[model samples]
Target chain A: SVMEDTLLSVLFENYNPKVRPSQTVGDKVTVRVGLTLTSLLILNEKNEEMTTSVFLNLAWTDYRLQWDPAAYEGIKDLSIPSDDVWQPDIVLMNNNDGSFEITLHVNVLVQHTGAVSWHPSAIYRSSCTIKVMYFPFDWQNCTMVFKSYTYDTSEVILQHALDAMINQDAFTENGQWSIEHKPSRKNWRSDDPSYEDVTFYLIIQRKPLFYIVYTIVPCILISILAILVFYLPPDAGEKMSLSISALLALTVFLLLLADKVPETSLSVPIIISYLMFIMILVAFSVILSVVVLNLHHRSPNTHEAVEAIKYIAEQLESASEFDDLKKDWQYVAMVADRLFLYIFITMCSIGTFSIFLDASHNVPPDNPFA
Target chain B: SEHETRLVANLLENYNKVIRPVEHHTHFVDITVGLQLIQLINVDEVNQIVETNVRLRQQWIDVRLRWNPADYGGIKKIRLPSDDVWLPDLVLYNNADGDFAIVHMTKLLLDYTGKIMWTPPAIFKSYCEIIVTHFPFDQQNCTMKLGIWTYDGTKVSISPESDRPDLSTFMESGEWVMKDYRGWKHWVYYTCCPDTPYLDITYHFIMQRIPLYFVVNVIIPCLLFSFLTVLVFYLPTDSGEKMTLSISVLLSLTVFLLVIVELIPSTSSAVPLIGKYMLFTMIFVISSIIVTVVVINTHHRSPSTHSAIEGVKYIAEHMKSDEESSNAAEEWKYVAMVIDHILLCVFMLICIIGTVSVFAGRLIELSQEG
Candidate 1:
């Protein structure tokens, strides 16, 4: 009945819908735009692509579309097909529509204030920066920027609406990245008239527990095993093999990390640095194990050892009570092995702790703006 | 002027009946588009993000049932501004500008056979995908897809005039070498109209990466570092700087890895073969350091510090009987020397095996992928 009413047809008459709402000079229609992030569907750091469910609200006053409520039996609002009305050509600048389906929620509502509102909800693809400096312990900030494509500042002024900027209630939790702060900013460059945009920044911190349990813990355990290689008795003949195996195991973990961390050279990822550091330490242990084994295998008949052995043997024979003085050099080698074992273990533990401590001090330094 | 007016009057005799209004929503116009690459303007390497500009000479044919026997005045062919003809909504799906450049040299050739041909030159920035797996040594497969956005496969079918780019007319870029190309039609499905398939033509361009900068900066340094790791074993353990030498080499390798991390994308699919090589060599260098410490410890062993009495006595007696024995202690010195020799051989063998297997395995995987 409402669609067939004479009041609607009379108001639509001579509307000249092809023309913009304003035909006069210096008369710009102001459109208030707001976005609510319903969900963070995907944040692909490797591809630099972000998919999000954005509930976009666009409201603007159309002077020609206003109607007297009394004339329409106190009706204050009307819903119409979007194709039947003239709408702003607002497009997502960084859209990857083909990658995913772009659902066009093209319903327009006319309100009493001559205000026309369009709510276009869709899963949008936008470009984002992925900084993996701290990696597993890292935080990232991704942004979504919206602007009108066809409307310049003079034709349609764009601003962020308070209620539509962001909605925490609609946001669904993500498994890998936890939302920290949601901040939005309005920007209009003075030199660029066509550049009127609103950007929403999503500060997210990686849930390190996943990496801690899966990757970091294994690295620590392997590193400890690497250090313990020095404690294996020289006679066991497995010290070198054990350390070498540990070194290789650490290499495997480092390679695994290379994939998840952001490919960047500006600053080495703290996790990777730790991995490398431990690798170096583990490597050192392999060389030390060989040294300890070599010392442990020394015999007295060698040129250098013969004189010491002969002297110690003579000393023991001359004393009224013969002692094990002849084999004292072997005791010295054992002491050297023990000394290095403690020193290397302590160095590795302390070194790893300090590096992690240093990295913790550098936790992306709290995004000043965020 | 009289002839021209007569011609025009004759052509316009049944304009209303023959020249259909632009709003023919039910009619599916068959349009065939073709492209001729004029010049490869430039590639924006700073955004190695696939932003490129190119000049193309585009040609298309549109066949509509518009010929009327009464209006032609026996004319077989005619020329007019393309703006005067009905055009299909042909668009570049991956156009950076969102719209095609205006048709500068617009002309419409209408034949009595009911066919219209249009030719237009356009400069476009097309979207492309960039693969930086091998980075400086990497080859990219970029594509520019073109199609009619408003028409489906049934309403509009697109076919490429030629399946390859004209090499003679191609201009070369300093950073990219266009090696080959392929053009094919694809059916893209839309969720809103799943039954109606969207037809598109994709042009795939394979580009090879030139390694002028990378060879000097990345390759040379990496090779030099690799050489240093190998040379670590040659340094005598007596010098006591073997550990220092090997550790420094490991440190440099870590620095090199860090530098490379900045250039490559961090994707988890596969680690770069070159990166794996570095990790392998660094482990070898670290193992050398461990071996160095072992040799040093062996050299420092005193016969007095060892306890194996029977073996020492047996070696000493055996050497004395041969008349080549320099001293009793010389026998132990020979044993230490023997240990060092065996370790050197073992270390060298493991290094070669590790390096060879890793590199060879990667090469085989790559060949298989190819």
Candidate 2:
């Protein structure tokens, strides 16, 4: 009769897995949760989401339904349906932990250490904090916290597996960002006494060469061109247009940065701020060009001059009144234009150098290329 | 306590016998999600979006349809692991990214009275709409829309607990200040089943931008730079600094304009008034520069360098009506001087008028809105 019935029929008959294993209210079970990050592919740092293939290992001791080896014909391991067994409801707290398509490997080994083990390998969407302050030249740290869904600390004691980095070689190679450090685990707790969780921290840094070549290099060249606007002779009649076009180009660069960077008003990126400062200076230079050109093109018949212009013209005459003196506003304006050209060019050079140099100086010495 | 533990064990052991499985198809479950925004994070201008990270709490309540007093073994209430109890697959319908997380999950408290309640609290970052037409001076109206992702109204009735975010205490973001909020409870129909609609809850928030930072960093500096252009004409041409000063101012203005472009989102539909102001001022500077070149060229002209045109000479003499008649050697010089004076006054007027009109247009629009 025992041989005809077989072991499965006797073990599962009217066996309700929905019932709690403990006979008393105060009894508890320990759920050891371990995750092997088989492959981590950053989906979108700006969007604060990452795709990770985690070999989730959940192990716990289920003392119920234990059988003598001789009675069961020395069957050491039994493969069972996970849903048919009372398994702890553990989940990644910062991810969508429901409705995962997984091949649940629920098995019971004969020995005490063999316990109940349900290992599911699935890709999970984890939340990440993206700090874009340094932008192209930045590093960020993201985390994933996992804990029990409905079990209290007393009902289910959750712990991380001892060797957390079992799949260290599984991280996928990323072109834009590089993993700065190995993943580490820490205890994550909530205000509720019953809430217990384990968190994993991942540090990563962006490879800024792409942005530097595409964005920063072009901006520098364009900014240099803007400075050259002053060197154009007034007779060329392209000074204003040149400056304006450069301004428009700078705007395009800014738009590109805005589209790429996360929208946060807490602080402006230094490069963006510097670009804005350059725009302001360029706009001022346009006005200066106008003043110089206006003075340079003044007709000899002009009658009135501003007090400073009149004073300077009088002083020029006192210095050299006998040198074929023609006390006209035209001569004075030409001199003013020349003086302004030199002064403004120098100022612009100093300004551009200081702002850009300051930015470069801030780059950490350890990574000079960034 | 031992008797109570034995009774609870007996009740859980027979839980499956009391509750029917896969039988109820017409029964409906009413679920309410009470949302409270604990913190305002940021509003993105270029993307027209907002996201909030907060400790989110959800309350799910349902009624048990099948239960037998005899099967419970005289137990009035029992605590069982949440996985043992059936749970509704409730998810965010308007989640920009299909992801959700849970932390500190409270167990489902089941009683003989047929009430089942589960509360799970976790930090969530939810996406919402952002209106950025008036960015920097813009106001945003973002809403978090929630509904059943898998079920229709017949199976699950979803609704908000209240008509607003229950913000008894809220932490604010520096850039955006929350002005007001409202909640809308409604039903949305899907194309699959037009008649059977899904109940939805939408939480709306109106936030105003704080302009202090922008005004100081961008606006004030821009205004001051613009005014500096007007002073360029005051410098004497004899000092040989007019062109240098004017070009320098123009260059500065260009930099400022770039700064504004960087700060604001690139939108073609409606350009910010400040951008328009910067553009207008740049145009004026260019005009002034061109005029100065023309006047200075005329002043430098001589019998040998550039023969004075008969028409220019006649016009120049007419402009010199108040000046004394001079010898042949000084005639051209006197004519050029008179013309320079007249042009300077006329150019000054044009610069002043242009600046006033540009700013006036912007002020009028703002006032009309106010």
Candidate 3:
């Protein structure tokens, strides 16, 4: 065999880049870039490079048009394909290793001057292209590639990548950016270089726990507290005390909740509806307590009712000569007590169940920012 | 000739003014509400004196009185009416400077008015206060005069004579109609002259339409609620489901009161009357309910004990039924509910009464101290 000195033989497997500790524990992480402008080029051994001119293109899919006052104030017509002036800068960076990184500095721009329009809306997108061998003297073919490599694959390339790059702006040094691919990126290949683009949704989704703490927990507690009010005898110090206490607690919570919500808003939030429902129920608890107490005071004595029953029983017992009639009056007291209990329990069950179901059905369970 | 007649008529009017009653106060504050008609001439041929009306209305020692000049005069030879109560020690100001004096004594006058006119003794002024009193008299005959005078260093000039012009003319002007003025105390009479029938006098005493939030929103509702609560106690519990029914009504009332309270703002005014009543009723009803429950429970526990607590037991026993007892494991559940309603109502009532009494008593004490 002839010993041929080949460039491929010079490649060694032992050399490795310095390892950095992962920012997050998990190996899997997603990274997104918000770049104003981007350009790419590929160099080959012939001292030749392929340079591709890419017009403004979509940076995200779902291509939603939106307006975010806080994030992009004063930007009118946040739609794509605008004649407004745009000053985008080169934003892509490539490591000697195969990994590529991009930083996008997102801000409220006075205006956009590009081939494509980017306005704040439900979806915001911008486009850039992979200029492979930008200096092609006479181009035969050009290949543009994009891919989202996730999990074990990205780990092999950037094992130190964090789990999730939250609260991180790719454009700023302080902003977090995961080293791993998002597993969602894909290549866009078309004859037209301007077609390479994607769109993203810029909306707020409430954290699950936020709803549980501010809304769900309070509602459940209020419902239970309402039932407790029924359990308490009206005369018990606990009835009013507990009611007032609950009322006070509800009031304080309402105030806190009010501050959290927008003052100028017209539509009621789910949490407010929940709070109002339970508060109404608790108030009813106090009223019911008063009613029960009064009823108890005014009602005829069980002794009287039993005596009347016994008198009737006596007349029957003597005339009919039935031994059971004589004994029935003695049991009248017990019988009345049982009847009273049955009616009360039934009423309470109906009341609580009906109210609870009504509250749930009538009130929504989400914030309506829209 | 007409001018001469008018002057003569004005002099006669001023002559009548001095004859009216004028009462003064022990506190160097004298109020004389009388009409003075003076005449002046425009030319030598027209021998007329300027006929202007002068009247005074004063509140003194829980009494409101008026004084008027009986006749026109030059500086001396003024005829004083004997029947008029003249408080000589009262403060005096040149009639022209009296307007400023009135402004300076605004608070003192209000205090006097409260002590006299609104005899229950109340303070009604913050920036302004208004008292509208309807008198049984012909509007044309009862002339009103007002003046504004401010002292600037040395000189004080009553700007001009002015009178209140009623904006709403539902009541016919210059027409005498027999109408009931049952709530008012007194009326005054006077004649109009060239300058005497002045109009458009702004009185700080009568602020434009002040709304009585406390009386309308708090006191009326509170009184209604209290009475309603007391009525609940008087209802007989022997009525079927009386315990449950009463409690339910009470609960509805409480919820209503609380909802109304929620709508109002928590302000500097003493704990509103509505809050006091709701809380009071709540206490009373709770106590009543508890006692009733206890009686029922005791009656069920032993037949021998039923007589001691016969009042509550008698009502509860008749309300309970054997079928209800069979429905539950021991029929005690129903018994517990019926008894629960009764006892809760009693306790609630007691509590409501006690708490309310305390608040009412405290309010009374504060009033006395004030």
Q: Which candidate wins on TM-score?
A: 2
* Residue A301, model 3, lDDT: 34
Writing each residue's lDDT as its tens digit, candidate 3 over B171-287 gives 221112222211111211135422221111222211111124233534443544553444443432232224334344455555655554554433212122223334444554444
After best superposition, candidate 2 residue A223: deviation in angstroms?
7.1
- Which sequence of candidate numbers ranks them by TM-score, best first? 2, 1, 3
Can you list each candidate's DockQ?
A: 0.05, 0.09, 0.06
Looking at candidate 1 chain B, the ten consecutive residues that score lowest on lDDT are B265-274
lDDT of 2 by residue, A239-298 (tens): 433443443344445434544543432332323444454454444444444344443334
- In candidate 3, chain A reaches a TM of 0.25
Model 3 regions lying over 4 Å from their true place? A1-272, A300-370, B1-224, B231-370
Q: What fraction of the reference structure's interface contacts does model 1 contain?
A: 0.00
lDDT of 3 by residue, A261-348 (tens): 4332222122333334444543444344334344233323321655765665466448644544553453243422442354357445
Candidate 1 error regions (>4 Å): A1-13, A68-71, A92-105, A133-143, A163-169, A234-335, A338-352, A355-359, A362-369, B1-370
What DockQ does candidate 1 have relative to the true complex? 0.05
Quality of candidate 3 docking, DockQ: 0.06
- In angstroms, the error of model 3 at A117 is 17
Tens digits of lDDT, candidate 1, B258-307:
54554443321232222443454455445545643554454334453224
The candidate with the higher DockQ, 2 or 3, is 2
